[PDB]
Amino acid sequence: SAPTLGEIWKRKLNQLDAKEFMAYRRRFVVEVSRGTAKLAWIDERGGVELKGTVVDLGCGRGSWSYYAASQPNVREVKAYTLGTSGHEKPRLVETFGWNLITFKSKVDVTKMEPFQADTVLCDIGESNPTAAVEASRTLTVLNVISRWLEYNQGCGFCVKVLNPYSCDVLEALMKMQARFGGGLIRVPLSRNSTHEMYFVSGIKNNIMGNVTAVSRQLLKRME
Ligand SMILES: C[S@@+](CC[C@H](N)C(=O)[O-])C[C@H]1O[C@@H](n2cnc3c(N)ncnc32)[C@H](O)[C@@H]1O
């Protein structure tokens, strides 16, 4: 049922006008950066142990990196993002832990050699009206992340899954869970206009069931 229900949600979402979309997207949603709040939520729930060498793949402005850099078990943060035309570039600030981060823009992380890391973070996935476009980008991220997880036996991880209801993606996630453990969670701070979920090392759950539960929740909210 998962692809059917998420696909229904997507087609219904795309039928909303500007006013309906704006009202729908915040309905019952919890709530400085959105990025910070989401990683903080996952961290406080025990979704991911932030420790040692943290990689932040697709760091954009870098909220996750600054979050990670302020945590007691983190030793360094290596942050990477495209930062090319019309893509977010890291925003340097003077907050606690800033000196632990190395930001590198102008890097396509899908083409980077994995290296040593104790925690793998990745928040790549831009919403697109076409669910199949989102599935393809999601698959690409998961394939890249699998190489990192293979290279770093036992590392912690927290990975955005932009479209988790697509059948190919579900099978990909089950395979990652079979290989690396972990589970798939919905952050209640996510807006109703995205079906994004997070593949995390700290929580071990029923992936397909959680996805379906999120589809049914987001559909009910649109009713
Ligand atoms: C919007 S950030 C997610 C938010 C971020 N965690 C934060 O807290 O600010 C996702 C970033 O991934 C970047 N990105 C997308 N594809 C990429 C790729 N192939 N290689 C490197 N960065 C990529 C995008 O430019 C985008 O800025």
For the CA of 110, the nearest atom of ligand 1: 19
Centre of ligand 1 to C-alpha 82, Å, is 7
Task: Write the single-letter amino acid at 104.
Answer: K
Listed resolution, Å:
1.8
Centre of ligand 1 to C-alpha 200, Å, is 18
d(CA 135, CA 90): 26
* Total residues found in the chain within this entry: 223
Q: With CA atoms as reference, report the closest residue to 142 among 119, 118, 163, 113.
A: 163
Q: Which residues are annotated as a binding site for S-adenosyl-L-methionine?
A: 64, 108-109
Centre of ligand 1 to C-alpha 1, Å, is 30
Angle at 3 between CA 8 and CA 202, to 5 degrees: 115
Helices vs strands, H then E, count in the chain: 7, 7
Centre of ligand 1 to C-alpha 108, Å, is 10
CA neighbours closer than 13 Å in the CB half-sphere of residue 192 = 24
Burial environment of residue 26 by CB neighbours within 10 A (0 to 12, 13 to 18, 19 or more): exposed
For the CA of 34, the nearest atom of ligand 1: 8
Query: In the block, which residue shows the tokens 């078990």?
Result: 73
Ligand 1: list residues with CB < 6 Å.
Answer: 33, 35, 58-64, 80-82, 87-88, 107-110, 123-124
Q: With CA atoms as reference, report the closest residue to 180 among 158, 197, 213.
A: 158
Centre of ligand 1 to C-alpha 122, Å, is 8
Site to probe by mutation for ligand 1, drawn from 34, 38, 61, 82 as the one with most ligand atoms within 8 Å of Cβ, is 82
Phi, psi for 65 (deg, rounded to 5): -70, -40
Phi, psi for 136 (deg, rounded to 5): -65, -45
Long-range contacts for 80-83 (Cβ within 8 Å, ≥24 apart)? 80/55, 80/56, 80/104, 80/107, 80/109, 80/112, 81/105, 81/107, 81/109, 82/58, 82/106, 82/107, 82/108, 82/109, 83/107
For the CA of 140, the nearest atom of ligand 1: 19
Q: Which domains does the chain have, with CATH numbers?
A: 1-223 (3.40.50.150)
